[PDB]
Amino acid sequence: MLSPADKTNVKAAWGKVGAHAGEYGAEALERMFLSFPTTKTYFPHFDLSHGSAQVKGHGKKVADALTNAVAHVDDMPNALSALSDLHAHKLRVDPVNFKLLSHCLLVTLAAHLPAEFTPAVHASLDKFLASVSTVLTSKYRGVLSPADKTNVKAAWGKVGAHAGEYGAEALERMFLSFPTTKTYFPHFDLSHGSAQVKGHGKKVADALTNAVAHVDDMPNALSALSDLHAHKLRVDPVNFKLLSHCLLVTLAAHLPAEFTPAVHASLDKFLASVSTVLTSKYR
Amino acid sequence: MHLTPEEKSAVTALWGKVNVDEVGGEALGRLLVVYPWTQRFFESFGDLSTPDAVMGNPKVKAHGKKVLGAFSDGLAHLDNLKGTFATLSELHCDKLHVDPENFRLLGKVLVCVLAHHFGKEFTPPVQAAYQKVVAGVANALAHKYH
Amino acid sequence: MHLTPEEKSAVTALWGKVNVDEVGGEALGRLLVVYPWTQRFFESFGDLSTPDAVMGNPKVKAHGKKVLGAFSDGLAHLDNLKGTFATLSELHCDKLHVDPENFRLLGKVLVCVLAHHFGKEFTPPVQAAYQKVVAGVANALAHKYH
Ligand code: HEM
Ligand code: HEM
Ligand code: HEM
Ligand code: HEM
């Protein structure tokens, strides 16, 4: 994700933060608890009142972790490894919450760095925080294991020649369940039975068949598709989770025997991987 | 919470064939397997190490039955989900400290379980009606968080 | 909307100090810079190749004023956002084909812009009030999507 320009921007901005990192971290936390109260569910053992030693203390730990991340921006996975382990295995904070704290850190930096917070730096810090979030969340379920890859191949195998018909059904399910996704297809006839949907469904299905075949080399297998969605179609990233959900529902509706809990978990991880890949070039 | 006549009849018709005890244990079990961080709320449930461990754990099954049982009650009150779930909403917030995002995840899983169980019968329009319902129930359970 | 009397006043007071045209151009420009995929609707606008080009593009600025002007007018109707944005919601859906997620992205960017513009005056409680307002406005604009 991060380019060198991005790294220079982050380094610059965070440098300016300097001795205030701890104070900014506490403010970001306070801003999060107030703007997004559901985040307090993770801190029922804290005194969350303004200025508590607990919030100040925690704020300093969070900022020291981001400082560590900035200092090892080219090697984030390793620098933050103990932290990703703690969050994935002990704390188990739902991943949606990281975007919330990232937004609040961004608002905090904006309020304190009037000279430094230009549009380019804003974009870099946003990408930086999204990368830190991704690293802290990577071990929740992890990358695809051999059992996962085996489960996906077995389930996709049973799909076989029905792949295109299932892709079309998945799109239909998506359009009906998540109406906003229709905004990307104003040129299509979306009625049930539509040949355009059927044809497109076949294309999505073939891309996935291709991804299953290249499960260990997905970024290259999907490279042209990533370019296409990122720069030409420019589909907002949130929509990929909606089509993934609909594909899972289609698979469940058609694989009574193979959609076991373990296979369900492997397929969900697989679809989230395809989604990450399809959106990696957006920024 | 407004559903068209076809959407409400789709939901109701299907729910009559659902064995809550069975579907409940399945959904809660799969939630714990597919999204393991959700296990943070069930430390006292015992062995949750493997899919087979989670799926056969009597406490998971027992709890899933309680959960879908309450969900069933909400189906009978589709017009006022907020009012029906207010007590449980406060309970999930104040005493249990359950991030509302868990309600959305359970909703996704339940839709997968219904498709799995009913197959061809869980058609796109029926799923779409169920998606409105699980989103409504999740919003109703998160309503009293503060 | 539901915002307490104090939240409404915090919102209104700060907004009275906003140069709508300046902030509008700044927010739409940053949206296009920070989340490049939102540029998809603006190819007729011309040069959007660099952050400087986007920020200095007169079409982006003009659209920014138009968008924030309508937002501005919506702050006068905090008790009825859905009603105020109903036709714009339909327009963005049926004619413009704008994914509602874009409204949420604009909301985040607008909050960062107010924080940059106002510094210490954009306190955590003021932000909290504005967060509720941007979520409400995005929900109202997405309400008529079908
Ligand atoms: C992207 C920012 C994040 C970073 C860098 C971060 C960093 C840290 C660090 C450094 C610690 C303490 C490590 C230790 O003492 O062993 C920690 C603890 C913790 N984190 Fe995070 N965290 C992040 C996001 C989140 C989010 C979004 C939440 C949930 C709202 C969260 C909730 C917690 C909790 C509950 C603890 C344990 C607190 C305690 O008992 O002291 N974290 N985090
Ligand atoms: C992760 C799943 C996805 C895969 C594997 C995928 C795959 C594809 C493929 C293979 C194509 C055809 C490209 C070509 O013609 O060369 C394509 C086109 C397209 N995709 Fe996706 N895509 C995915 C998700 C999405 C989502 C979620 C949306 C929007 C809700 C979307 C919207 C489009 C659009 C607008 C087209 C152009 C269709 C046309 O005009 O013919 N894609 N995609
Ligand atoms: C479909 C939405 C849900 C409904 C209707 C529901 C319903 C219930 C009910 C009826 C109880 C029993 C309360 C009592 O005994 O007074 C309860 C307890 C509980 N719920 Fe929920 N719940 C839902 C979702 C969730 C989710 C997804 C989680 C978190 C993963 C969760 C975690 C718990 C916990 C930890 C308890 C306490 C169990 C114990 O006493 O050991 N709930 N819920
Ligand atoms: C606070 C959120 C927003 C409000 C209140 C708003 C408001 C408006 C208004 C008042 C118009 C003119 C309507 C007319 O000509 O009848 C408009 C046009 C438009 N909007 Fe939005 N909008 C918002 C966000 C967005 C976003 C985030 C996008 C896309 C990234 C967008 C893209 C457009 C486009 C492409 C047009 C047509 C412009 C033209 O024909 O020159 N809007 N919107």
PDB file of C-alpha atoms in Angstrom, chain A residues 11 15 79 132 154 156 197 224 228 246:
ATOM      1  CA  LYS A  11       7.559  10.445   8.881  1.00  0.00           C
ATOM      2  CA  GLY A  15       7.987  13.803  13.555  1.00  0.00           C
ATOM      3  CA  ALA A  79       7.521  -4.513  14.328  1.00  0.00           C
ATOM      4  CA  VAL A 132      -1.500  -0.438  10.678  1.00  0.00           C
ATOM      5  CA  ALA A 154     -12.828 -29.280  -2.738  1.00  0.00           C
ATOM      6  CA  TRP A 156     -15.058 -25.146  -5.834  1.00  0.00           C
ATOM      7  CA  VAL A 197     -26.421 -10.574 -15.625  1.00  0.00           C
ATOM      8  CA  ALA A 224      -5.639  -6.972 -14.547  1.00  0.00           C
ATOM      9  CA  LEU A 228      -9.742  -2.502 -13.884  1.00  0.00           C
ATOM     10  CA  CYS A 246     -23.908 -13.424  -1.683  1.00  0.00           C
TER      11      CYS A 246
END
